[PDB]
Scaffold this motif. Sequence first.
Motif, mmCIF file in Angstrom:
data_model
loop_
_atom_site.group_PDB
_atom_site.id
_atom_site.type_symbol
_atom_site.label_atom_id
_atom_site.label_comp_id
_atom_site.label_asym_id
_atom_site.label_seq_id
_atom_site.Cartn_x
_atom_site.Cartn_y
_atom_site.Cartn_z
ATOM 1 N N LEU A 19 -16.144 0.230 -25.667
ATOM 2 C CA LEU A 19 -16.198 1.351 -26.615
ATOM 3 C C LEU A 19 -15.279 1.076 -27.814
ATOM 4 O O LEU A 19 -14.124 0.699 -27.614
ATOM 5 N N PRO A 20 -15.708 1.260 -29.068
ATOM 6 C CA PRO A 20 -17.024 1.818 -29.412
ATOM 7 C C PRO A 20 -18.203 0.924 -29.013
ATOM 8 O O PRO A 20 -18.018 -0.240 -28.656
ATOM 9 N N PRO A 21 -19.433 1.434 -29.049
ATOM 10 C CA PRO A 21 -20.569 0.726 -28.464
ATOM 11 C C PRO A 21 -21.243 -0.178 -29.494
ATOM 12 O O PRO A 21 -22.316 0.112 -30.025
ATOM 13 N N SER A 22 -20.591 -1.289 -29.780
ATOM 14 C CA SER A 22 -21.127 -2.207 -30.791
ATOM 15 C C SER A 22 -20.952 -3.668 -30.371
ATOM 16 O O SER A 22 -21.931 -4.381 -30.146
ATOM 17 N N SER A 23 -19.712 -4.137 -30.290
ATOM 18 C CA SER A 23 -19.488 -5.568 -30.055
ATOM 19 C C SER A 23 -19.178 -5.847 -28.584
ATOM 20 O O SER A 23 -18.026 -6.018 -28.187
ATOM 21 N N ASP A 24 -20.225 -5.936 -27.775
ATOM 22 C CA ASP A 24 -20.043 -6.362 -26.384
ATOM 23 C C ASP A 24 -20.576 -7.790 -26.250
ATOM 24 O O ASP A 24 -21.755 -8.061 -26.479
ATOM 25 N N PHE A 25 -19.701 -8.721 -25.896
ATOM 26 C CA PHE A 25 -20.121 -10.126 -25.824
ATOM 27 C C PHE A 25 -20.502 -10.477 -24.385
ATOM 28 O O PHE A 25 -20.022 -9.871 -23.429
ATOM 29 N N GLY A 26 -21.374 -11.464 -24.218
ATOM 30 C CA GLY A 26 -21.831 -11.808 -22.867
ATOM 31 C C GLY A 26 -20.912 -12.836 -22.215
ATOM 32 O O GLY A 26 -19.708 -12.619 -22.082
ATOM 33 N N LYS A 27 -21.470 -13.970 -21.806
ATOM 34 C CA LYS A 27 -20.618 -15.030 -21.257
ATOM 35 C C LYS A 27 -19.884 -15.725 -22.403
ATOM 36 O O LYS A 27 -20.425 -16.597 -23.081
ATOM 37 N N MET A 28 -18.633 -15.348 -22.605
ATOM 38 C CA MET A 28 -17.824 -16.017 -23.626
ATOM 39 C C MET A 28 -16.942 -17.037 -22.900
ATOM 40 O O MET A 28 -17.459 -17.913 -22.206
ATOM 41 N N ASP A 29 -15.622 -16.932 -22.998
ATOM 42 C CA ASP A 29 -14.772 -17.766 -22.136
ATOM 43 C C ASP A 29 -14.190 -16.938 -20.982
ATOM 44 O O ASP A 29 -13.039 -17.110 -20.577
ATOM 45 N N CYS A 30 -15.010 -16.064 -20.408
ATOM 46 C CA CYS A 30 -14.614 -15.385 -19.171
ATOM 47 C C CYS A 30 -15.171 -16.191 -17.990
ATOM 48 O O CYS A 30 -15.598 -17.335 -18.149
ATOM 49 N N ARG A 31 -15.192 -15.619 -16.791
ATOM 50 C CA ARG A 31 -15.792 -16.354 -15.670
ATOM 51 C C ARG A 31 -17.304 -16.107 -15.633
ATOM 52 O O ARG A 31 -17.894 -15.548 -16.558
ATOM 53 N N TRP A 32 -17.949 -16.560 -14.571
ATOM 54 C CA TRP A 32 -19.415 -16.566 -14.546
ATOM 55 C C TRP A 32 -20.046 -15.181 -14.714
ATOM 56 O O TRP A 32 -21.003 -15.015 -15.470
ATOM 57 N N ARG A 33 -19.535 -14.187 -14.004
ATOM 58 C CA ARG A 33 -20.189 -12.869 -14.023
ATOM 59 C C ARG A 33 -19.402 -11.810 -14.810
ATOM 60 O O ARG A 33 -19.683 -10.617 -14.685
ATOM 61 N N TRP A 34 -18.440 -12.207 -15.638
ATOM 62 C CA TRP A 34 -17.701 -11.216 -16.436
ATOM 63 C C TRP A 34 -18.037 -11.369 -17.925
ATOM 64 O O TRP A 34 -18.739 -12.292 -18.340
#
Length: 42
Positions: A19-34
Motif C-alpha cells: 500500500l498504496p496499491p501501485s508498485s508491487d514487484f514480483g520475483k526481485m532479489d527476494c527468495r523464490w516465493r516472496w
Amino acid sequence: YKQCHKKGGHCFPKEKICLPPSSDFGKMDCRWRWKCCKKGSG
C-alpha cells in the motif's frame, strides 16, 4: 537489496497488501516465493 533497492523496496511474503496499491514487484532479489514492495506517495 540488489535489484529492488534501485527502485526502493523491502521483501514481504506473497499474501499481504502493498500500500498504496501501485508498485508491487514480483520475483526481485527476494527468495523464490516472496515479493518486493514499494509505495507510491503515502
